[PDB]
Structure 1
Amino acid sequence: AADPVVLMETAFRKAVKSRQIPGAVIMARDASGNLNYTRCFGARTVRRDENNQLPPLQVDTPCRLASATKLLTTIMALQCMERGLVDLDETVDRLLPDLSAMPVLEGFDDAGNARLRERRGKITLRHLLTHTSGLSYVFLHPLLREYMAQGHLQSAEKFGIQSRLAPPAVNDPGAEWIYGANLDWAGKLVERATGLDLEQYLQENICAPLGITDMTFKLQQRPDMLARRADQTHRNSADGRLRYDDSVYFRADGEECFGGQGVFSGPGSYMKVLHSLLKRDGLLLQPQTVDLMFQPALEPRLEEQMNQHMDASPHINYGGPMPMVLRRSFGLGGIIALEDLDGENWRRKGSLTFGGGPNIVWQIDPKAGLCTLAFFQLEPWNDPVCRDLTRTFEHAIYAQYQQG
């Protein structure tokens, strides 16, 4: 290895030895196809097995991707566009007439009555994939917070509407960037345009081309990869020690396919998606279509307010290991760096990035010719030693690779 990489590798092993992280999978690939950096550290749980050992994280270990699923669903959405089933600026009301019928929540009275209102303008597939449709996640928006407390989402059952699709919009399309259930809608777009449930689409149109056999929504129907699945671990906010996280169990996710989250896979298979997109090999997506994913999709006003929002909310930190304050846009699939994160030393301008709940982070850097993947199974998102370790990971392999 190189000097910076052996120091980073030691930084990781000390975090496993000193109980800071349970484990991590770390992977980096070149566009030229001759960088194959993949290391594994520590365990896939904090729970000791029947053997009284910690079973190790490994490159094929099935892992909860959480919101890192959104990238996969962006590909499925764009795959449908390539095939002339949809168009980016086609109104969604053909394939999503239930979304298109939803109103926008304007606010409340002094009496406390909810003011619903007809949407101004039409929602498009491009809006969904850039989080500019105008819908938010309930627990983020103060209007949706109260709307939920009033109990108006309880009637979704009656009309057969799915819980995650139930909330009304908080704004019009093209007004704001707002993080929401857009890929859950995009997933529905894909299903009804193609006539297949997401899971069969994923298998046929993403796993098969790349030779993947450990990527699925239905983890319960795969006993072989369920037997060696990673566990979730949570970091205590009090003492900073890590404990077993059994929150998934009590939630009962339970065989329900949606495009925003839900997919389990090995880190190796997820890097295979990042790798294909980087080298323009056409197995998932037409190179011209990939070019679009890295194009700033946001209008100047929208990107200005998206930066304001992200810069003003460090407790969420969408741009994980990147500088807390940084000029970004959004392409189709993730956040785009509108500038070099640190001259030639780190991610270059035009690089695409998004992450996942258990501190999963991916990035693709066309201009630098690199793509990296930092894979953890540790909550909450925006964890400091995960963020820090990832930061030292990227810096190290960018350094080794590009000069000398």
Structure 2
Amino acid sequence: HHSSGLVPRGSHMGSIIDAAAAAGPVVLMETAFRKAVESRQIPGAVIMARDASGNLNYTRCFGARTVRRDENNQLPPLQVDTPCRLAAATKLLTTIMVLQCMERGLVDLDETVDRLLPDLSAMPVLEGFDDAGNARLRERRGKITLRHLLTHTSGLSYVFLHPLLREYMAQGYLQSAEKFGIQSRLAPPAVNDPGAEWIYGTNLDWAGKLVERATGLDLEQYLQENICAPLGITDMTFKLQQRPDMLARRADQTHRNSADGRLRYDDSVYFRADGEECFGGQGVFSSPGSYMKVLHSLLKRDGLLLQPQTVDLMFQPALEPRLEEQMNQHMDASPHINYGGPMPMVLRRSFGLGGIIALEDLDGENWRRKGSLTFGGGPNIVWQIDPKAGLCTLAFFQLEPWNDPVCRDLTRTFEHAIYAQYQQG
């Protein structure tokens, strides 16, 4: 029997083991993250999950925001409020800003870009190269609309992804299209006509210019007034170099070397210069906490950023059958790029406004459902919103290259565990 005036706890090996039940999925998953930090496989990570109701409000932070030791010879922690490089996780923010312009009657999604982006309309299509080493350029067929930009179906690509453009750079055509070591996302030509194929490209850099020109505000000021202010966010900016308080606390980028799998400090150009202009495809710095506030508002359909019916538009498959099948073919054949991060490498998908849409359940009732929206950012950041499950999640790393196996595996383990314990319906 228990001791007088003391709580009856476990008094021997039998009842102490039985004092608490076995470890559930989330506890086991946290141990995997702690082991990855301890064994030096990752620098650190922040993982977050929320439902609409508020009953799920889960945030865990592991490890360091850098591999560089501080003034006290320590590795400072990656925190929920640590300023991080979002890279392509910026695209969701820019998509929201575009849709607000639509709501306010400043733009129409199906109007051609010619009016606000005559500099894009005038850009030719790079068809190939001549034998002497000269670009063969031609006129675009059909018009680019704002909806082509939001769905990556405009004909635009990225220089570091398409072979025609990689050659274009090698020939010296983009020597003068860069400042502070940051290359312009507006200078390079298109590689196809609009509507022809899904191609990942500088579409949101152009869409951000459209927002600036539609509103008469620079994207930074538009961001502050229309996304940050309504959510009470004070640390989300294109202009990190103008915020000494964020600079003093920011993450460093870490890179994993292909040869020995070791983590090294990545002296990224993006952390020493903001660049002259706001690039809505890649340019925002923020904390995981503030990014989750964006995801959560969208999940809740609380009208703080967009009207609920406009948010619903983001989750609708935007691609006609021909493009849907071409995008899926491309993505299935490109696991070395892997736009979908932790998702199964073969999956029926479409593209919405702001990310990839799952057209089927990822694993029946165990994980993300049909209708879920997702994308990511370079440093292994992955976000998703799942209206059917009533969940949104984010996994924030500051580690390149994209599609790192350790990060992807941990991210999958995180989501699986959260869905197993907390998914509803």
TM-score range, shorter chain: over 0.9
- Map Cα deviations across residues 160-182 of structure 1 (whole Å, 9 max, x no partner): 99822111111111000001100
CA distance in 2, matches of 1:402, 1:158: 47
What is the CA-CA distance between 1:255 and the residue it aligns to? 4.9
Structure 1 distance, partners of 2:271, 2:422, is 44
Contact 2:84 2:287 in 1 (8 A): yes
Shift of 1:153: 3.4
Once residues 365 and 66 of structure 2 are traced to their aligned partners in structure 1, the CA distance between those partners, rounded to angstroms, is: 37
| Distance across 2 between alignment mates of 1:98 and 1:78 | 22
Q: Which blocks of at least 5 consecutive residues in structure 1 are unaligned?
A: none
TM, length-normalised to structure 2: 0.91
What secondary structure sits across from 2:62 in the alignment? strand
2-side partners of 1:368 and 1:153: how far apart? 46
* Alignment partners' CA distance in 2, 1:341 and 1:236: 31
Query: For 2:271 and 2:86, how far apart are their aligned partners in 1?
Result: 18
Match of 2:6 in 1: none
Aligned to 1:46: 67
Q: CA distance change for structure 1 residues 312 and 251 in 2, over 3 Å: closer, same or farther?
A: farther
Please state whether the residue corresponding to 1:220 is helix, strand or coil.
helix
* C-alpha RMSD over aligned residues: 2.3
Superposed displacement of residue 80, structure 1: 0.4
Going from structure 1 to structure 2, the CA distance change for 1:41 and 1:204 (only over 3 Å counts) comes to: same
CA contact (8 A) 2:179 2:275 kept: no
Q: Secondary structure at the match of 2:136?
A: strand
Per the TM alignment, residue 112 of structure 1 is displaced from its structure 2 partner at its CA by 4.2
Question: Alignment partner of 2:114: what SS?
Answer: coil
In the alignment, the residues of structure 2 paired with residue 317 and residue 24 of structure 1 have an alpha-carbon distance, to the nearest angstrom, of: 20
- Do the aligned residues in 2 keep the contact of 1:66 with 1:356 (CA within 8 Å)? yes
Report the more deviating stretch, 163-172 or 338-347.
163-172
- Residue 339 and residue 312 in structure 1: after superposition, are their counterparts in 2 closer, same or farther (change >3 A)? same
**Deviation, structure 1 residue 51:** 1.1
Change in CA separation of 1:144 and 1:238 when aligned onto 2, cut-off 3 Å: same
1:23 and 1:40 in contact (8 A); partners too: yes
Of 134-143 and 335-344, deviating more is: 134-143
2:105 alignment counterpart = 84
Q: Distance in 1 between matches of 2:199 and 2:178?
A: 25
Task: Flag the 1:124–1:223 CA change in 2: closer, same or farther, 3 A.
Answer: same
Q: Distance in 2 between matches of 1:23 and 1:255?
A: 31
Question: In the aligned structure 2, how far is the partner of 1:157 from the partner of 1:399?
Answer: 47
Higher mean C-alpha displacement, 134-143 vs 4-13: 134-143
1:250 equivalent to 2:250? Answer no
Q: 1:357 to 1:332 in 2, by over 3 A?
A: same
- Paired residues of 1:2 and 1:400 also in contact (CA < 8 A): no
- What are the Cα deviations for residues 21-42 of structure 1, in whole angstroms up to 9, with x where unaligned? 1111010000223211011111
1:237 Cα deviation from its structure 2 partner: 1.2
SS of alignment partner, residue 179 of structure 2: coil
Q: Structure 1 residues 124, 52: closer, same or farther in 2, change over 3 A? A: same
CA deviation digits over 1:114-157, x for unaligned, max 9?
A: 22111111100000000000011112111112222223334668
Q: How many residues align?
A: 404
Whole-angstrom distance in 2 between the partners of 1:249 and 1:306: 30
How many Å apart are 1:247 and its aligned residue?
A: 2.8
- 1:78-107: per-residue Cα shift (whole Å, max 9, x none)? 110100100110111000011011111112
Offset of residue 256 of structure 1 = 3.3
Q: 1:241, CA displacement in angstroms?
A: 1.6
* 1:293 alignment counterpart: 314
Per-residue CA deviations over 1:362-401 (Å, capped at 9, x if unaligned) read 0000011100000111111100110000000000000001
Alpha-carbon shift at residue 262 of structure 1 (Å): 1.5
| Residue 191, structure 1, aligned to residue 217, structure 2 | no
Aligned to 1:235: 256
Quote the offset at 1:2 in angstroms: 6.6
Q: Which moved more, 1:244-253 or 1:171-180?
A: 244-253
User: Quick check: 1:218–1:255 contact (8 Å CA) kept in 2?
Assistant: no
Q: In structure 2, what is the Cα distance between the partners aligned to 1:219 and 1:250?
A: 8
Check whether the contact 1:220–1:255 (CA below 8 A) recurs between aligned residues: no
Q: Which sits farther off after the overlay, 272-281 or 49-58?
A: 49-58
TM-score normalised per structure 1:
0.96
Question: After alignment, is 5-14 or 162-171 more displaced?
Answer: 162-171
Instruction: Please give the alpha-carbon distance, in whole angstroms, between the structure 1 residues aligned to 2:206 and 2:377.
Output: 19
The structure that has the greater radius of gyration is 2
Cα distance between partner residues in 2 of 1:35 and 1:394? 13
Contact 2:95 2:150 in 1 (8 A): yes
Q: Give the Å deviation of 1:257.
A: 1.5
Matched, 1:354 2:375: yes
- Cα 1:229–1:161 change in 2 (3 A) is closer
Alpha-carbon offset, residue 246 of structure 1: 1.0
Using the aligned pairs only, state the percent identity. Answer: 98
State the shift of 1:238 in Å: 1.5
> CA–CA distance in 1 between the matches of 2:23 and 2:227?
34
1:22 to 35, 43, 54: 43
Distance 2:275 2:181 in 1: 18
SS at match of 1:215: coil
Shift of 1:234: 0.8
CA contact (8 A) 1:65 1:357 kept: yes
- After TM superposition, the structure 1 stretch with the greater mean CA deviation from structure 2, 32-41 or 270-279, is 32-41
| 1:296, distance to aligned residue in structure 2 (A) | 0.4
Alignment partner of 1:138 out of 138, 156, 159: 159
CA distance in 2, matches of 1:85, 1:20: 48
